[PDB]
Amino acid sequence: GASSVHWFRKGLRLHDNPALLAAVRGARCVRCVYILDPSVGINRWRFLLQSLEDLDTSLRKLNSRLFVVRGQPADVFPRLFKEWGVTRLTFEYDSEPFGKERDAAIMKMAKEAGVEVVTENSHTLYDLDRIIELNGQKPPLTYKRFQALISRMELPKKPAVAVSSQQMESCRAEIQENHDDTYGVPSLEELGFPTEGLGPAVWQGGETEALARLDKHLEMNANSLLASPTGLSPYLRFGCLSCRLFYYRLWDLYKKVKRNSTPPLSLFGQLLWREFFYTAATNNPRFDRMEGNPICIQIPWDRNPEALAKWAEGKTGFPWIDAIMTQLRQEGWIHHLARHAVACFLTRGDLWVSWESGVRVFDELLLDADFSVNAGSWMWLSCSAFFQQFFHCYCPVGFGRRTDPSGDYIRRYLPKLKGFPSRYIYEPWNAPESVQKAAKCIIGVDYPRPIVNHAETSRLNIERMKQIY
Ligand SMILES: COc1ccc(-n2nc3c(c2NC(=O)C2(c4ccc(Cl)cc4)CCCC2)CS(=O)(=O)C3)cc1
C-alpha cells in the first residue's frame, strides 16, 4: 500500500481531517509531519507548541508519533520523499496568497517525484473559489453581498469522521529510539524564548483543549472583557477546532433550544465574517498593504514612530487603551469591542497611523489573527475597504466607561491605577492631586499623561476622512 505523509500547517487536529483520512486510506504507512521554519510573540509560539504537543500525544494513543521537522518545505520534502519512500502527500488547503504559491511549488515538485498529492479545504466552511465564481470572478466587497451568495450555496460539508484506531494500527510507522532527539516538539527555550516566571497560559493550545471548550461553549461587563473558558477563536485560527464541527454543533443547539430548525445567519456571524475575509484575501497578495491593494482606499496616514510604539506597548496614557493593549500582549486575546476601541484610536480616531502598522502589531500578539482576518478587520475598522457607510465614534474614555463602569478591567491589567475611584479611572489626569497621591499614582510620573488631546485630534481626523470620501 501507500507510504503517506500528512502535512500539518493549520488543521492541527485529528477530527474533521479529510486530508488525513485520504493519507490513511489504503496505506501501509502514514507519518504526520509539522515543518518548523527557522516579529512573532511568545503567546503565538507557545500556543503552536502546545497544539503540536497535543497532536503528538494524540498520535501516541494511535501507536504513532508526530514528526516535527526543521527547515523549509522546499528543501525538506525532497529529502523526506527519498528517505521515507513517500508515495502520497496530503495536507489541508491554504487559501492565503503566500501559502497558495508555496503549496503550488510543493505539488509541482511532488508530481515530478511521482508522489500523489491530495488536498482538502476543511479550514473554511465553503469553497472560497466557488463564491468568487458566482460573483462574476471577483470576491464580494460587502458583507451583505457575501451573505446573499452563500445563502444560495449548498450548506457546508458536515465534519468528517476522525481516523479510527484500527486504521492507524494498520499503518503504524517505525519509531526510532531517538525520535524525540530528531523529531520532538521543541520547547520555548529551544525556539529562543527564555521563560522568566511565565504562568499557565490563559489560552492552552491544542485540539483536546479545543474540544473541551466547545462542549462548555454549547452549554457586556468587566467579566465579558476577560478571557472566557468557552472562547474558541484561537482554536479556529490554528485549526485545533474544525469550523464545520462548530457550525453544525451550533446549529444542533439552536434547534434544541428554539422551535425553528432555521436559524438566522447572525448565529454564525463570527464564522461568516471569518469566511468573508478569507474569500476577499485569497486572490490578493497585497491584502495586508495599502499601496497596490486594489480594494484599499489610499489614505495619507501619518508616520509617527513614537505614538505607534506607545500604542503598541500600552503607554498612551488612556487607561482603557493601555489596559486592552496590556491584555493583548500578556494573553493573546482581547474582546471585539476592545479591538474596535484600540484600532480606532490608532487609525481614524486619534493617531492617524496606518492600519497596516496595526496589522503588524496584532500579527505579533493576537492568537486568532491571520493574514486574511487581521488585515480584513483593520481595513474594515479604519474605513479603508468594504464600502464603509459611517464612521463609528469610540471615545477612548467614554466607550470604556460604558463597557465597564466598575473600572475593574483597568484595575486588573493596570494595577498601578488600582486605587483610582471609578469616576476617575478612565481619565486619571482629571483626578485632583489628593486623589492621585491616595492612589499612590502621580500622573506624569507613575503612569503617563494622555499623549493626545482626544477632543481636538478626533475633530481634525473626522473631517479628513470626510474630505477623503
Ligand atoms: C482591527 O483588528 C482586528 C479586529 C477584529 C479581528 N477579528 N478576529 C476574528 C474576527 C475578527 N473581526 C470581526 O469579527 C469583525 C470586526 C472587524 C473589526 C473590529 Cl475592530 C472588530 C470586529 C469584521 C467586521 C465586523 C466583525 C472574526 S473570526 O473568527 O473570524 C476571529 C481581527 C483584527
225: helix, coil or strand? helix
- Burial (0-12, 13-18, 19+ Cβ within 10 Å), 215: exposed
- Start-to-end C-alpha separation, the chain: 62
In the 3-class helix/strand/coil scheme, how is 251-270 assigned residue by residue? HHHHHHHCCCCCCCHHHHHH
| Alpha helices (runs of H) in 85-170, residue ranges in sequence order | 97-112, 128-134, 143-152, 165-169
Kindly give the distance from the C-alpha atom of residue 378 to the centroid of ligand 1, in angstroms, as a whole number.
8
Q: Residues 6 or more apart from 14 whose CB is under 8 A from it?
A: 20, 55, 58, 162, 163, 207
CATH topology of domain 1-122: Rossmann fold (3.40.50)
Residue identifier of the C-alpha nearest atom 18 of ligand 1 = 377
| Residue owning grid cell 524564548 | 193
Rounded to an integer, what distance in angstroms lies between the CA atom of residue 384 and that of residue 241? 31
Kindly give the distance from the C-alpha atom of residue 365 to the centroid of ligand 1, in angstroms, as a whole number.
14
Q: How far is CA 118 from CA 5, 23, 96, 123, in A?
A: 10, 8, 18, 15
- Header resolution in angstroms: 2.2
Cβ contact 434:376 at 8 Å:
no
Annotated binding-site positions for FAD: 233, 270, 336, 368-370
CATH of 285-469, one of 1.10.579.10, 3.40.50.1820, 1.10.390.10, 3.40.50.880: 1.10.579.10
Rounded to an integer, what distance in angstroms lies between the CA atom of residue 28 and that of residue 45? 34
Residues with CB under 6 A from ligand 1: 233, 236, 270, 273-274, 336, 339-340, 343, 362, 368-369, 373-374, 377-378, 380-381
Among 345, 351, 373, 394, name the best residue to mutate to test ligand 1's pocket (greatest count of ligand atoms within 8 A of Cβ): 373
Question: Can you name the residues that pair with 120 across neighbouring β-strands?
Answer: 92
DSSP letter for each residue of 271-323: HHHHHHHHHHHTT-TTTT-STT-TTSPP--PBP-HHHHHHHHHT-SS-HHHHH
| Alpha helices (runs of H) in 332-421, residue ranges in sequence order | 336-344, 355-365, 371-381, 398-403, 408-413
Among 44, 273, 321, 387, name the best residue to mutate to test ligand 1's pocket (greatest count of ligand atoms within 8 A of Cβ): 273
Q: How many CB atoms lie within 10 A of CB 176?
A: 10
> Taking Cα atoms as reference points, which of 428, 458, 408 lies closest to residue 319?
428
Rounded to an integer, what distance in angstroms lies between the CA atom of residue 177 and that of residue 121? 35
CATH of domain 123-159+207-284: 1.25.40.80
Within the chain, all domains assigned CATH 1.25.40.80 are found at 123-159+207-284
Kindly give the distance from the C-alpha atom of residue 143 to the centroid of ligand 1, in angstroms, as a whole number.
13
Kindly give the distance from the C-alpha atom of residue 373 to the centroid of ligand 1, in angstroms, as a whole number.
7
Instruction: Say if strands 2-8 and 66-70 run parallel, antiparallel, or are unpaired.
Output: unpaired
Cell of 298: 489610499
Within the chain, all domains assigned CATH 3.40.50.620 are found at 1-122
Question: Can you name the residues that pair with 118 across neighbouring β-strands?
Answer: 90
Q: Residues 6 or more apart from 465 whose CB is under 8 A from it?
A: 348, 383, 391
Rounded to an integer, what distance in angstroms lies between the CA atom of residue 414 and that of residue 59? 42
Rounded to an integer, what distance in angstroms lies between the CA atom of residue 145 and that of residue 139? 10
Atom of ligand 1 nearest to the CA of 378: 1
Between helices 42-60 and 355-365, what is the axis angle to 10°? 40
Rounded to an integer, what distance in angstroms lies between the CA atom of residue 354 and that of residue 333? 22
Rounded to an integer, what distance in angstroms lies between the CA atom of residue 433 and that of residue 229? 40
Beta strands in 21-158 (DSSP E): 27-36, 66-70, 88-92, 116-120
393: helix, coil or strand? coil
Question: Can you name the residues that pair with 8 across neighbouring β-strands?
Answer: 34
- Vertex 415, ends 196 and 368: CA angle to 5°? 60
DSSP letter for each residue of 7-27: EESS--SSTT-HHHHHHHTTE
Q: How many CB atoms lie within 10 A of CB 432?
A: 9
Cell of 437: 497621591
Instruction: Say if strands 66-70 and 88-92 run parallel, antiparallel, or are unpaired.
Output: unpaired
Order of strands, sheet of 88-92, starting from the edge strand that comes earlier in the sequence = 66-70, 27-36, 2-8, 88-92, 116-120
> Taking Cα atoms as reference points, which of 29, 8, 28, 27 lies closest to residue 19?
8
> Taking Cα atoms as reference points, which of 332, 337, 342 lies closest to residue 366?
332
Exp. method: X-ray
Within the chain, all domains assigned CATH 1.10.579.10 are found at 285-469
Residue identifier of the C-alpha nearest atom 5 of ligand 1 = 377
